[PDB]
Design a protein around this ligand. Structure first.
Ligand SMILES: *[C@@H]1O[C@H](CO)[C@@H](O[C@@H]2O[C@H](CO)[C@@H](O)[C@H](O)[C@H]2NC(C)=O)[C@H](O)[C@H]1NC(C)=O
Ligand SMILES: *[C@@H]1O[C@H](CO)[C@@H](O[C@@H]2O[C@H](CO)[C@@H](O)[C@H](O)[C@H]2NC(C)=O)[C@H](O)[C@H]1NC(C)=O
Ligand SMILES: *[C@@H]1O[C@H](CO)[C@@H](O)[C@H](O)[C@H]1NC(C)=O
Lengths: 56, 49
């Protein structure tokens, strides 16, 4: 829910009606298919909260 | 507020309970279906009063 935005250097997901930037993660996003069909797609890291947990 | 049209339609698809990816994965087909449907309005309106 919400929408992707950038301030020119960093990528955030945020609500439609009130600017509140959030770091992009596998919890605030969902996946479908490979890049090649999607017009206007761009590259960034999507963070995974599990990795420090397993690293312990 | 300006918004790109392929993003506006994903909000409108999401509004009817169809997941956003269903627009982007079909965007060329959806655009052709719309453009062709508008064309049929001209043919209908021109053909019959
Ligand atoms: C876009 O947003 C990011 C995160 O708010 C900004 O990066 C931070 O900038 C401040 C000030 O230079 C630093 O103290 C932080 O350490 C930066 N964080 C990161 C993750 O790098 C970034 O400056 C913003 N871009 C613009 C053009 O304003
Ligand atoms: C996003 O990143 C991928 C790689 O992770 C980029 O894919 C490469 O793009 C160049 C230029 O088209 C090709 O020469 C490489 O062969 C591609 N590599 C792979 C593994 O496909 C992709 O272009 C990046 N997207 C953007 C918009 O820059
Ligand atoms: C936006 O327009 C530019 C040319 O002005 C084009 O190169 C680009 O691929 C377009 N991107 C999208 C998301 O339509």
């Amino acid at each position: 829910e919400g929408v992707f935005v950038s301030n020119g250097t960093h990528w955030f997901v945020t609500q439609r009606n009130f600017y509140e930037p959030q770091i992009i993660t596998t919890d605030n996003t969902f996946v479908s298919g490979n890049c090649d069909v999607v017009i206007g797609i761009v590259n960034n890291t999507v963070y995974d909260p599990l990795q420090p947990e397993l690293d312990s | 507020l300006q918004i790109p049209f392929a993003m506006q339609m994903a909000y409108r698809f999401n509004g009817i309970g169809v997941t956003q990816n269903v627009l982007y994965e079909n965007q060329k087909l959806i655009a052709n279906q719309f453009n062709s449907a508008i064309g049929k309005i001209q043919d209908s309106l021109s053909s019959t009063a």
